[PDB]
Design a binder for this molecule. Sequence first.
Ligand SMILES: Cn1ncc(Nc2ccc3c(c2)CNCC3)c(Cl)c1=O
Length: 119
Amino acid sequence: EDAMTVLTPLTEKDYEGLKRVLRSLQAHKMAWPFLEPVDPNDAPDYYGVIKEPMDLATMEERVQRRYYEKLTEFVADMTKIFDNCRYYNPSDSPFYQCAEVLESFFVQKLKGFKASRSH
Ligand SMILES: Cn1ncc(Nc2ccc3c(c2)CNCC3)c(Cl)c1=O
């Protein structure tokens, strides 16, 4: 990651962009498995093996509460959603495929955010 992503404190202006990114993910057709926490009754041993669960509703609360101090922390929470999903699920799972497409979409939106920060 670039130094600005690691080191530059997030401003209120930055948080308008973070909310835009999050809303774009929540609206994506393939974000449906990630909107709310994994239901334990759908996924045996999930909370036994996934030590740091994450979901977009939890990130929405953190964005609202100004939890993130650096962009790298926001990216880390987002990356947890996808990494957890690919850890638990087989590569032919619909969940795994959602993580693959949504992560690519996140990286596109993230690159746009970082550039808007530079100007
Ligand atoms: C193993 N597993 N199972 C499920 C799941 N997402 C999911 C799927 C459906 C629903 C919710 C979450 C929450 N709200 C209810 C419906 C992931 Cl992302 C996963 O990895």
